[PDB]
Symmetry: D2
Subunit: 327 residues, 4 copies
C-alpha cells in the first residue's frame, strides 16, 4: 500500500459540511487584512476567498496556506467560482467599483447583481457583511438583491469610525481606547454623527462635566476629534495609498460577535426605517446587538433635534440615489 496507508488506518472517509465557515469576497488590501485578522483570531474552521483576478487569488491563498503551521484554521480554499464558498455562516463582501455618484453606485449595483445571487445560491442561510463603499447604500443593494431578512444583512458602517474616535479620545485623555466610550453613528463618511451625550470614561459623562463639548463654544474644540475621524481615511490614503489594517481588525471584531454569538453592541449599518422620522428603506449605523442570527436588536439612542435632523438628511439623500437605481 501507499506510505499513507502503511502509516494511517482510516476509521471513516465520511466527511461533513464545514461548520464555522467564513468567506471573504475581494482579495485587495482590505479583504486580505480581513482574512489575516480572522485567521489570527481563530474564528473559522474553513476560510474561502473569491475574486475575479485568478493569479492574485491563488497566490494570496497559497501564502496563507504556507502559514498553516502557525494557524488553527485547517482548510483555506479559493476560486473564481462561488462553489468554493458553499455553506458559509458569514460572507464578507469587500469587492466593488471605486470612483459621478449615481453612476458609481449603479456600477456597484451591476457588480452586486453578479456577486450576491452567487453567494445566496451557495450559502442561502449566511449572514452578509457588506464592507464595500458607499457601505450604507451597498448594504441596501445587497439586501434588495439577496431577498434576505434585514437581520442578516449588515454593513460595517461606522464601526471603524467609532474605533478611530475612541483611539483619538484615548490619546487626549491618556486612557486605553477600551476604557474610552463614544459613538459615531449615521451615514459612514463626512455626514456621520458624533453623539457627544454618550462620551464617557467610567460612566462619567464628558458633556455633563463640559457642557460646551462638541460645540462652537468649546474651548478645547472636541469637534476636531470628529473632523479627524472623517478625515482619517483621506490622510492615511495620502500617506500609504490605501487603508487596510484598521478595517481588517474592525471587521474581525464584528465576525467574532457573529460567529461566537456574543450579542455585543456595535455601530453598524442596519435598516432604520421607522426611527427618527425616517420612512424610506435606508440603512444607517446605530448600535446593534450582533450574534448568531446577525442583528437581532438595536439600541434606541436618545438624540437631540439637531442629531436627528442630521440622520434624516442623510436618509433623504440616500433614498434620492436609491430610487434612481436600476435592479
Amino acid at each position: 500500500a501507499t506510505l499513507k496507508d502503511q502509516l494511517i488506518y482510516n476509521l471513516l472517509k465520511e466527511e461533513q459540511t464545514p461548520q464555522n465557515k467564513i468567506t471573504v469576497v475581494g482579495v485587495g488590501a482590505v479583504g486580505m487584512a480581513c482574512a489575516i485578522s480572522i485567521l489570527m483570531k481563530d474564528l473559522a474552521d474553513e476560510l474561502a476567498l473569491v475574486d475575479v483576478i485568478e493569479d492574485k487569488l491563488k497566490g494570496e491563498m497559497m501564502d496563507l496556506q504556507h502559514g498553516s503551521l502557525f494557524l488553527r484554521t485547517p482548510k483555506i480554499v479559493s476560486g473564481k467560482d462561488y462553489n468554493v464558498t458553499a455553506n458559509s455562516k458569514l460572507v464578507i463582501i469587500t469587492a466593488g467599483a471605486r470612483q459621478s455618484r449615481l453612476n458609481l453606485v449603479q456600477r456597484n449595483v451591476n457588480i452586486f447583481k453578479f456577486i450576491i445571487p452567487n453567494v445566496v445560491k451557495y450559502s442561502p442561510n449566511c449572514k452578509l457583511l457588506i464592507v464595500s463603499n458607499p457601505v450604507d447604500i451597498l448594504t441596501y443593494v445587497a439586501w434588495k438583491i439577496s431577498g434576505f431578512p434585514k437581520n442578516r444583512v449588515i454593513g460595517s458602517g461606522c464601526n471603524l469610525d467609532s474605533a478611530r474616535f475612541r483611539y483619538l479620545m484615548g490619546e487626549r485623555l491618556g486612557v486605553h481606547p477600551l476604557s474610552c466610550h463614544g459613538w459615531v453613528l449615521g451615514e459612514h463618511g463626512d455626514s456621520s454623527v458624533p453623539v457627544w451625550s454618550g462620551m464617557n470614561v467610567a460612566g462619567v459623562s464628558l458633556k455633563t462635566l463640559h457642557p460646551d463639548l462638541g460645540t462652537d463654544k468649546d474651548k478645547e474644540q472636541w469637534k476636531e476629534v470628529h473632523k479627524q475621524v472623517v478625515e482619517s481615511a483621506y490622510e492615511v490614503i495620502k500617506l500609504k495609498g490605501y487603508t487596510s489594517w484598521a478595517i481588517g481588525l474592525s471587521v474581525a471584531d464584528l465576525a467574532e460577535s457573529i460567529m461566537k454569538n456574543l450579542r455585543r453592541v456595535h455601530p453598524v449599518s442596519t435598516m432604520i426605517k421607522g426611527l427618527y422620522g425616517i420612512k424610506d428603506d435606508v440603512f444607517l449605523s446605530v448600535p446593534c446587538i450582533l450574534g448568531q442570527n446577525g442583528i437581532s436588536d438595536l439600541v434606541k439612542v436618545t438624540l437631540t433635534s439637531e442629531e436627528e435632523a442630521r440622520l434624516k438628511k442623510s436618509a433623504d439623500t440616500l433614498w434620492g440615489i436609491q430610487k434612481e437605481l436600476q435592479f
Copy 2:
C-alpha cells in the same frame, strides 16, 4: 480647568520605560506582515517601526494605531530616526532591496546594513537581532560582524519558513495538521536547503523506516518533490501575487514568541555554525536552535547522512567565498 483635569486626578508622571518593546525595521510587505502578526499575538507593550520612506512609514503607523481598540499593544511609534527604537528587546530587520543576481543583492543590502545596524545597537545595546533580509544567511553574518554582539543574540530567520512550508505540504499529503507532521529543512535558506529525511515522522514513527526509498530516485511516491515544492511553491507565489508576506510574517511572529516569552522551543534558524560538519569558517546556516530570552542559547546536533553533510558543506564553502571578499 481642562476636561481631562476635571475627569482625571494624576497620582504621578514618573518613569515610563518599555518592558517588552519590539522594533521592525523596514515597512514593506514583509515588515508589515511581521508587525500585524506580532500585534495580534500580544507579544509587545510597544511596537516601533522604522523606514527611510517617511510618508509610507507614517501611514502604516497610523493605520495600525486606528485599530488600537482591537489590540493589546498600547503604544505604536515610528520614525526615520532610530531614537524611536530605544530599549527594544527584539529588533527585526526586514529592510533592503526586494529582489527582482544574488551577488548584487548582497552588495546593496550590505550597504544598507552598514547604516542600519550601528543605529540599532546604539539605541538597544542589549537587544536580540532577528535578520529576515535576503540572502538571510549572509546578512545574518553581516549583522553579527557589524554589531559586535555575541553569537547568541544575532539570529537569522533561516529555514524556519522553509520548514513550515515542508510541514504544510507533508500534512496535505497525509491528511494531518502540520503541527503533528514533523520534519526539518536545514542549511542554506532557499534554493540549496536540505530536507533531513531521517527526522520526518508522525507520532514518532519515522517515514524513512516505513518507506526506505523515501527521498531517493527509487521512491515510487516521489517524496523528494515535497522538498522540491518547498522551493517551487515560493517562486510560484511570487509569480502569482508579486511577493510573499503572510507566511513569512507568521513564521517571524512565532520566533518572536519563543524569544519574548523565553520558551526554549526549537526552531530551524540561522546561527554561526563554525565547528560543525567539518565547517571551519565563520558561516551562518540553519540548524535546530533553542530560542529564548537570550536568543540562541543552544543548538541541536543533527546526525546527517553523507549526502546531507556534503550539501551543508558545499553551502558553507560558497557562503564563505562570498563573505571573505566583503569589505566592512
Copy 3:
C-alpha cells in the same frame, strides 16, 4: 413599556440553538478544571454542567457565570436533569469515584450514558473517569455510538507528563520534546523509546541503552515517574486537577476546531498487535469534528506488542464479567 423596551428595539425573538455547545458531567476537581480550561480557550458558545449534588452544582455554575465579563461563552447552565445538556457537540464525562472501582463506575454510567445519548445523539463522548480504558469501552457499549465518537482521555496526560520530564532533563520546552506513552492509562502504560526525539534526532539511536536497565542515566525512571506522578500529587494535595483539565481542553480544541492533530487517546484497538477483544487502549489518533477519524499505526517492538496484548487480555478479563 419596560426599561428594556425603551432601550432596545427587537428585530426578531425566536430562540436559536448553540453552535458549539460542550457539556461537562461531574463538577468535582476534574470536571471544574476541564470547565475553566475550556472556557479560557474560547471553545464553546454554551457550557452545560451536570452533577447529582445540587447545591455544589449550582454554586459552581454561578461562580463561573460571575466571571462572564472575562469570558467569550455567553451562556453557562447547570442542572441535575440531562435536558440542560441537549444539543451538545462534545460531552465530557468526569463523574465517578476516585473490581470495586469498575463496578461502582459502571452503575453510574448505566444512568449517565443513556441520558447523554437521549439529549445529544450526535455528540462526541470524551470519557475521563477512571479506569478510563474500561469506562470508555463501557460508554461505547451502552451508547451504541460508532467508535469514532467514543474517545477516552487515555494516555494524553501521561504523554504530556513524559514530555514535561524529558524537557526538564534536556533543558528544552516540552513542545519541542517528542515522545509517546501508549497502551493502558496508568501502571501498565508503554513508553515508546524508538519515537523519542528532539528536532527529529532519535534519542534511542544516539543512546542505545535508552529504556533498558543498563542505562546509566536511567531514562526508564522517567517513565516510572510518569506512572507515579498522580500518586505523588494525590499524596501532596489530595487529588489531581489542573494537568488533566489542560489536557482535556487540548483534546476539546482539536475536536471542536476540526484540527486533525494527533493525540494519544483511548480507542478500540481490536485488529492491532494481535488483539482480538473489544478493548480500548491509547494509540496516536487523528482528532477532529467526527472524533477519531484515523489512527497512526506505530511500529512497536515485539516487547512493546506483548505489553499491549497483556493489557488487552487483562482488560477483557474484567470486561467480560461486567453486567450491563
Copy 4:
C-alpha cells in the same frame, strides 16, 4: 558524554534575572484560581507560588507543571521561603486568616495584620520594586495594612476591591437586558462587600443612560426593582459560599484581568481599592474602590466620578468605619 551533551551544544549557560515574573502568595482556592487564570492568559514568563503548608504547596506546583506542554509560561516555582519570589513585577496576596464565629471585626483584621507582618516584609525584601495586589479580605483594610508595612508609594499598592463586584453587576445587567456584559456598563465603588455603592448614573448601554431613560432606576419606588441587582451583587458571594463552600473562579478571572493591565501597561480603567484621602470629604488614610487607570507603575491616575449626596455620604460612612478599625490595629 551525557545524552544531553551528545544532543545539544551550549552557547551560554544562562541565566537572566526573570523579566515578567508574578508571585501568588496563598495556594488556597482563590490563589490557585488566580494562578490558573494567569497561566492561561500568558501574562508571565515565571510564576512563583508561596504558602506555609509545604505539602499542598508542592503538589499544586507539580500539578501545574504537568500541564506545561499546554502552557506558555516556562518556569513555575514554589517554596515556603520567599527567595523563590525574587524580582517579581507583580506580587498577588491571597493568604489570610479564616474567621472564627462570633469574632469581632477588629479581631479578625488584627489576625490578618499578624499574618501580613510576616508576609509583606518578606515580599519587599526579595522584590522591592514590585506592585502589590491585595486580594485577601477584608480587602480595603488589608490593602491599607500592606501599604503601611511595605512602605511602598500608594501607586504600587492596589486592592482587588470592587473589580469583581462590578463584573457581577455587569453580568446581572446583561442577563436582564439580553446583552453581553462587555457591552453593559456600570460601576460598583466604595467598600467591597455589604456597603458597596452602585453608581446608577453611570449605568449605560452604548452611551445611553439608563437613569435618564428611567429616573426611578435604583430607588425604592422603581417598579422593575433594579436595586435588587446590587442586592444580588452583595449577596452573591454568600450564596455561592453556602452552595459550594467558597468562591474561586470569578475572583481568579477578575485578578487575571487586573494583572493583564499591569503587566501589559494597558492603562485600562478598573474599580480597584486605592488610598482615597482628599476626595469625597474623606480626610483619613483609607482605601476604597474608585475607577483607576492601571499600568506598569500600578495606579497612575484615578477617575473623579461625580457622586450624588447620598453616594458621597455612603463612601464617607465607610471611610469612618474603616478608619475606626485601622487606628486600633497593632503593627
